Amino acid sequence: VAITVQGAQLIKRVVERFYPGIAFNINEGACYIYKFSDHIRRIRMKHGTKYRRQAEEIIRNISLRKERLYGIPVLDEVEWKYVFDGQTFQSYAFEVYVNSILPWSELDPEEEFLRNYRVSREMTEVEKFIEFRAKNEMQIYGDIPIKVWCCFINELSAELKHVPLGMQVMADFVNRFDSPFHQGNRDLSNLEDFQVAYTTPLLFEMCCMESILEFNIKMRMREEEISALEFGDMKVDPVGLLREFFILCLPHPKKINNVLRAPYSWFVKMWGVGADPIVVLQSTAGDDRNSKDVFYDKFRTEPNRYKALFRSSFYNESRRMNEEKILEAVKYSQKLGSHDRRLPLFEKMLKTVYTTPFYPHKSSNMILASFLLSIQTITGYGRAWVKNVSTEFDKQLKPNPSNLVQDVSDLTREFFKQAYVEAKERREEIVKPEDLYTSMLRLARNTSSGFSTEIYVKLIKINSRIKALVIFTKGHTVFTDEELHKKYNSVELYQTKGSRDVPIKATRTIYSINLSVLVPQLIVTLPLNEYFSRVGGITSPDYKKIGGKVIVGDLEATGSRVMDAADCFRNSADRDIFTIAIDYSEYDTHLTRHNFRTGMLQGIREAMAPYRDLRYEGYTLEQIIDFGYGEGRVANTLWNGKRRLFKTTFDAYIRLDESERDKGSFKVPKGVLPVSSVDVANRIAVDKGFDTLIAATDGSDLALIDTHLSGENSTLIANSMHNMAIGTLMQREVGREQPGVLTFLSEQYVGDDTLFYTKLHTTDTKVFDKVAASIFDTVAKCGHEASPSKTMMTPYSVEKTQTHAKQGCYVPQDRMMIISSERRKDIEDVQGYVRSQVQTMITKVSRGFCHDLAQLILMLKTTFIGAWKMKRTIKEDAMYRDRKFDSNDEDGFTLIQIRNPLALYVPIGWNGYGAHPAALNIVMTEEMYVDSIMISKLDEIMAPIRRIVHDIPPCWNETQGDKRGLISATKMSFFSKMARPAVQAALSDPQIINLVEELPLGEFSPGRISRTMMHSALLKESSARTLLSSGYELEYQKALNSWITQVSMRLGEESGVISTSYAKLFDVYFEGELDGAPHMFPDQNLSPQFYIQKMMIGPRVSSRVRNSYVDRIDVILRKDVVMRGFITANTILNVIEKLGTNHSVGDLVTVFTLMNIETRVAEELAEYMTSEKIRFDALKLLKKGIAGDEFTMSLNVATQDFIDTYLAYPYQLTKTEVDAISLYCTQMIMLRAALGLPKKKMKIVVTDDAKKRYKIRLQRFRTHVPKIKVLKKLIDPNRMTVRNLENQFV
């Protein structure tokens, strides 16, 4: 019944399916197979090299399958045909798909999403453009080949005895059409040779996702032991609904999913609000509606006061919009295909959404609610095509006495002035001219660099984009008068647009801006970006300060989704709160110069009036304002992007003359022929006569933009501030037209999203309708467009920032991708990467996902990540050595490595991954391992992994390779401005001082600081990192052949360091019967392994324990502008270990200033270090990421209440030592709660026998003193802790 044996058998059968005839053994930690490749052999043969048997090494291997190389068997990867053993199911979805195929004659090249275009055996010029489009927009990426996923689906279907529809259509396709394409393992983005249709990889990805969701819903259903899901009092089947969705969305996947994702969310938001009895969970916090101190009592049912209101016209139109939206999508899907099916269950359920009650305390409804929001996860990353369009000024709304545009501009200008004053109040000010040449590195994270720079390295020329290299090369030219007085509105100067994908929606466009525009923007906008980062403000409408109103930046500060968003649960639990959410459409489009830009410019202009006495190299501030924003600089600018092309015949190009055939500078796609201008394109373009495509090349189709840009340095602040103005106008108008009906209690502004918590003083339908009409009338006259179909106005349901709450309980939606990925990634560090995915899977399972399927997915992924990526090394007689010889007789062979799945459950430091089989939130560590093996209950769980330890080879990791083999030829010309006067002082000397600059500072020394900074900048660039990756194979060979099968479990540590193994010095007792009363919690959709933890231990109701000494060091280091991105606390402590702690404040100030730390941070760090050295122990605690995941953030652990309740420890211990105890205590108590053990208090015990006390004293003394290193650093033993340890335990 243990998961460790079932998963082992599962993955074993998957491995034997993937590689037939495998010699895989469960009891061995690794396996090695050979693979043969002929691609290098051919290219060697064309140089006339002589080889032995050519295709024989193919034919003899594929057929007989018994040839051996140095005794190690050689196998070939299994064919596409036999992945599902040739079974068929004649599924209707297959004919639905093949009916949706389209010939090339119906091409619309400007399509956002590609349709199901057929692939012909012969070639044509338009098919080249189709191939070019498909290669880019149809990439899967990810980290695991799709065939491995298909094998896993087949095996798990065999295990669970159920047949997903996705596997059915998969088998139906492969039974006749054989391979879809070819994918390489060394680089998964090499998809090539499309066989049948250009949209096949989308089919495979969607079918695997659908099968994963079908498995997950069935296993989660079995966990709760329910027979069917429930809607009201009616039974419903989830797999039926999922198949019903899947069959309909298949004609045109991306478009249908994008147009259909909204009604499903609206139904979930609107479910159960109008029921006569309502079940709510009590929650109580502070007076403010954004208090974060909630606590939960119990459930109750209450009558609904709002029941009579739901006969309103507004709700009827809201429902009717969604019925039209579902029906038009169904009609389009039926028309494109050859089917007459529809969505009967969903339209049946939509008919009575209001009156059917919602039951948060019944899992049959909560699972359904969570599943409907997670359905949309089958069309990830939504790559799309975008077109360049100008500003079209004619449709802009002119200000007239019937609108509110001038009022919006005036109020937003007043808000800029007020916010600037508020930022000045918080000692945040604009940059000073003394800081002009050093603050340019402080650009916001949404910024982008316009011009890429060229670097010579020693030999090779390369290009780079990141701010550091471009600035360090050409920063002095940024402010020069030549670059200031130029405008980007002609052919000679222009800027290009980029694009980045998003997980579900269409690809988002971004703007690249030259640094000469960004820096003047930064000069003014830096203090406001700094100031608005703070949290915890008051959001009452009658409060003067506007700092707390903006929620931008007030997200993920705690780090837990459930913890920081508790106001949603609190407001949804309150019957007296009415919540309103306005959803705008094309917000960034409607920020015009009539309403937004001019008032903002005026706010900045009369903002800098008190600073008019300052000058910047002759220029004054109001000239810098025009430098940052102005015509030809930000507004009224030309922009380049995707080309525009038109449909013509072939021979029309032949009748053209050479004036229309002149090819310009701009590049054109593969399958399109050039043409001079767009005018001749309009003359020649013919619609019915599709034979060829032509694209203009003279630059007449660039975009003219006079609208707010997403790449600017103040986009979020401006957007939220504009929304503040809009909300002020909305409140003013609703107060004026309908006095006293609606009172605003809280207003919330983040991005384009707006939220209101208000009190409604009436239940009459006609008053509510007039109020809603007034709101929509006001927002319409204001210039924007507000959709009445998405705008939400509800008593009991609250949504913000993709977070949903219904009746005081958390309804999670899961959008975490598992198969695909946003961009291609290369795994520099396998172990940290697997750590990252297991951390993300913790979040996924915390969002309602099944725990066992998560374990199975990690069990799969832990085996195949390291495979296929080692090369130019061969193994013979258990010895690794370089690839054969110069004989070139076995040159075509490579070695592939397969890891034991159970390596997922062996701790870090033992070459493994720190996951725990009992629950994923517990981190394996050596002490945790020995504790688990000493527990008698876990033996059956721990039995297989007992024999798998001490067999794991070292993991692939290119990150620790650090050498000097990347000498650059380009130099740091701007160094004369980057170096602090501390650095600038020690380079004017005639090398006399050079010989006395012998402090142990390492690479940060005068005469070498510039080179080391440049070197680090290159190592930030991956295209520069790729040069040193060649030599890492030899070091990996050294790591392999230096490995010895031995487990060390060194519970000691480096004497400067302390870890959680320290608690293993003492024995641990469990006594006392604690209270068994269960606690309440809002998230009622968890796995039982997590549910037991959330019930035994309540939610966190306080701040976590005080930050560590390293945390304080990092916070102090977060004050230096130029070194925050270059200095961590580890870098400081590494220098300190050689420098020593026995120094005065002046010594440390001088040392830090020499290390490019500015003198104020130097003084602060020196004083704090002196205080810590004099007062406390000062040892840094190393933790294995424990208590750092998503779920542990929400538990009542690692807090002072937790220590006071659950822990009793001797008083002789120090604060760092008791913290090291406390983390182990949290881990142990979490593990005991997970196993269902009785709740008992835990104590650390020290016995009366003398010999144990002698060893404890010896160990503590050797731990607190770094032995012979006391000579190196001359640390005075007169520090309080070490001097006090003389007779602590005597």
């Binding site: 504790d931 209950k937 293993k1064 010095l1065 024995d1067 641990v1068 469990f1070 060893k1255 404890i1256």
Partner: peptide, 21 residues
């Protein structure tokens, strides 16, 4: 009904040394 106390490294070393001799 319970897992019982957990021994330190020193107790385990003493047990191993006693078993050895």
């Amino acid at each position: 009904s319970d897992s019982g106390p957990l021994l330190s490294v020193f107790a385990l070393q003493e047990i191993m040394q006693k078993v050895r001799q």
